[PDB]
Paper text:
The NIMA-related kinases (Neks) are a family of Ser/Thr protein kinases, first discovered in Aspergillus nidulans that are conserved in eukaryotes. [name] is 1 of 11 Neks found in humans, and contributes to the assembly of a robust mitotic spindle apparatus. Human [name] is a 34.5 kDa protein, comprising a singular canonical kinase domain made up of a small, 5 β-stranded, N-terminal lobe linked to a larger, mostly α-helical C-terminal lobe. The intervening cleft between the two lobes forms the ATP-binding pocket and active site in which phosphoryl transfer takes place.
Therefore, in an attempt to artificially induce a stacked configuration of the R-spine, we mutated Nek7Y97F to introduce two additional aromatic residues (L86H and L180F) to mimic the R-spine of Plk1. We expressed and purified the [name] strong R-spine mutant protein (Nek7SRSL86H Y97F L180F) and demonstrated that it is catalytically active and retains a similar ATP Km and Vmax to that of Nek7WT. We were unable to obtain crystals of Nek7SRS in the presence of ADP/MgCl2, but co-crystallisation screens with Nek7SRS and compound 51 were successful. Superposition of Nek7SRS bound to compound 51 with PKA in a prototypical active conformation demonstrates that Nek7SRS mutant bound to compound 51 is more similar to the active conformation of a typical kinase than previous structures of Nek7WT or Nek7Y97F. However, the conformation of Nek7SRS does not exhibit other hallmarks of the kinase active conformation: the DFG motif is not ‘in’, the Lys–Glu salt-bridge (K63/E82) is broken and the activation loop is mostly disordered. The crystal structure of Nek7SRS revealed a configuration of the R-spine in which residues 97 and 86 are shifted laterally compared with previous structures of Nek7WT, and are positioned above H159 and F180. This is broadly similar to the configuration observed in crystal structures of active kinases such as PKA. However, this is not a correctly assembled R-spine as the side chain of F180 is not in perfect alignment with the other R-spine residues, but is packed against the C-helix. While the monoclinic structures of Nek7WT have two distinct conformations of Y97, all three chains that were fully modelled in the monoclinic structure of Nek7SRS.51 have the same conformation of Y97. This happens despite the different crystal packing interfaces experienced by chain A versus B and C. Therefore, we conclude the partially stacked configuration of the R-spine in the Nek7SRS.51 structure is due to the presence of the mutations, not the compound or crystal packing. As with previous structures of Nek2 bound to purine-based inhibitors, compound 51 forms three H-bonds with the hinge region of Nek2. This is also the case for compound 51 and the hinge region of Nek7SRS, via the main chain O of Glu112, the main chain N-H and O of Ala114.
Residue numbers in the entry: 21 to 184, 196 to 300
Amino acid sequence: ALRPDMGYNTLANFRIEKKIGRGQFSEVYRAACLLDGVPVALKKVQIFDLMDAKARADCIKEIDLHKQLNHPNVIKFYASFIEDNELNIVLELADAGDLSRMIKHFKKQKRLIPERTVWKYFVQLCSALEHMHSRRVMHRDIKPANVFITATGVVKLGDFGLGRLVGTPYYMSPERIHENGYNFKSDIWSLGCLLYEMAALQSPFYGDKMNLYSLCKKIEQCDYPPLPSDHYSEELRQLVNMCINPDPEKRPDVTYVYDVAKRMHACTA
Ligand SMILES: CN(C)CCCNS(=O)(=O)c1cccc(Nc2nc(OCC3CCCCC3)c3[nH]cnc3n2)c1
């Protein structure tokens, strides 16, 4: 029935209000904690089935890491447990939904995001990434569907990746296109595509045809529809070209990107 002793460690202490969305391989529900009333958001990873013992251990190792990060622009982490053969991850609830919901809303009404608000948000999530990279931690999953906004307007980064019937991680990168491996400069790439979707409300390499080889060819040569010159500063447009660079060596460190956003956030007050 109820068990305060465990605290946030058993699903018996929450009331599932509604299902807010379905993740990559997970379903996230809104909930209320009965013990103290705080609103929390559950994550059903569905690792019970179709997963080996090592992959489960790996999934935990990521959770143990994500719990160590404490930052204003990273979603708070409350509890992770296995109950009834289902890994539930209860995280802080952000009123304004995932960033993709904001993009899909704006796109629905055919109005672009002002440049002054792009920097307002972009600087926040850059702060989170500089925090991680400075501690030798790569996010490995930066997409609009995993960026969250509070009613106040603050932006938060989210959970780590669950990659552990063809699938596309929203922002596929060249290092991973070939058998090279995810690295730090590969997180910038995702960050670059994110800045582009805020401005254009559509992924840069989103195409009319979903062919993997067709899309792969469009990533080798950085060919993508440029942004409206009038509405978005050259400072921004060049920062996108800078991050969406095939060769990882040419991309910038998260700091330089972080410094540009700060400077540009002040300019567009
Ligand atoms: C839609 N309404 C009628 C019903 C709910 C009334 N609004 S609401 O309660 O404040 C509301 C609605 C939607 C989102 C959010 N914010 C939120 N959503 C998450 O789910 C992530 C999931 C996985 C990726 C993409 C799909 C969503 C979070 N996960 C961690 N933190 C999260 N914060 C809040």
